[PDB]
Design a protein around this ligand. Sequence first.
Ligand SMILES: O=C(O)c1cc(O)c(O)c(O)c1
Length: 366
Amino acid sequence: PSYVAHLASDFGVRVFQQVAQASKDRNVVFSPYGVASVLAMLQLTTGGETQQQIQAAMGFKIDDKGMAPALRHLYKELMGPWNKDEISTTDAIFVQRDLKLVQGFMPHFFRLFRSTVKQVDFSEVERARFIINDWVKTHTKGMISHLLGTGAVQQLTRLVLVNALYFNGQWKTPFPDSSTHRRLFHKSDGSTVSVPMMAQTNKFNYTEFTTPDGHYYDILELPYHGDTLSMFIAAPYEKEVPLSALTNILSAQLISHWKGNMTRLPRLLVLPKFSLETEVDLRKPLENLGMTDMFRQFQADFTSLSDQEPLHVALALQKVKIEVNESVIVSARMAPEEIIIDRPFLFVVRHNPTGTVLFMGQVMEP
Ligand SMILES: O=C(O)c1cc(O)c(O)c(O)c1
């Protein structure tokens, strides 16, 4: 029954692979969970071939027994009392106000998701961008408030989807503030830059990992408070190893494979702070997974939502912000060995009780 979290996580991972491919040495943060969530919602508005494509890529039909309840249960678990403003997430779909909608579709949307498709009059362009940005502002407790991509909303815009998340976790064990210091970080083009790094020593759940194609990485787990979430960090051990070899095989099963081989060893960990924001225009990544009809103004099929339509998605966005920070004279217990994360690495944030992949990223330069 944690089955939908797996499928939703894997779909969102494949979307992240496509976006990583398009940004070679650029920082990127992303939510596998968020894109699956907004796309599971989009599913209900579609019919015919557009629907087939999305169900093929996602691996499940939203209408199917127990799929939506499960998603709902997961969202409610994410927003529960454990979460001290650590995570905000919002999904939304905006359709043009005028439209003759399919009878009984809006309520049925409400039954399955407990939220509504919004109606905006897109002919008041200036008003329509404000409404969208303010939605995202009000549902992320003000942490996210502008989407660049809304610059593209025009008079002819009829359907827009949006997803936004902010993450900033409390560590189970906080890094000591006095330990933070400037350290050399090696960038992928060979140059260096000085950056703040945190240090902590204790028993870290650790394993070495080899991809089937012979690429090596160090894998660390960092538990957040109460063990609800964890960050997995994956970093090459030499400088010429690409993150892609790892990213291109990434899955939920892959994390649980890490977890099964890990062991808690005493280590000094030195890790850069970072606060990163990414805005993704989802159309290429999604077309790349075969969801091409939805974006084409005649091939597109949203007849589950409206028959009075040429209806198609004019804008699909994800925006994400993630912060990893800590929460004189300076002392520590010595450890048999040191793990210095001074080269590009990937990270995964997971929801431990379901296995959901809430966030992933490659940090090329912090
Ligand atoms: O359908 C969701 O899970 C969702 C619901 C909301 O009410 C919301 O504000 C959001 O940003 C996402």
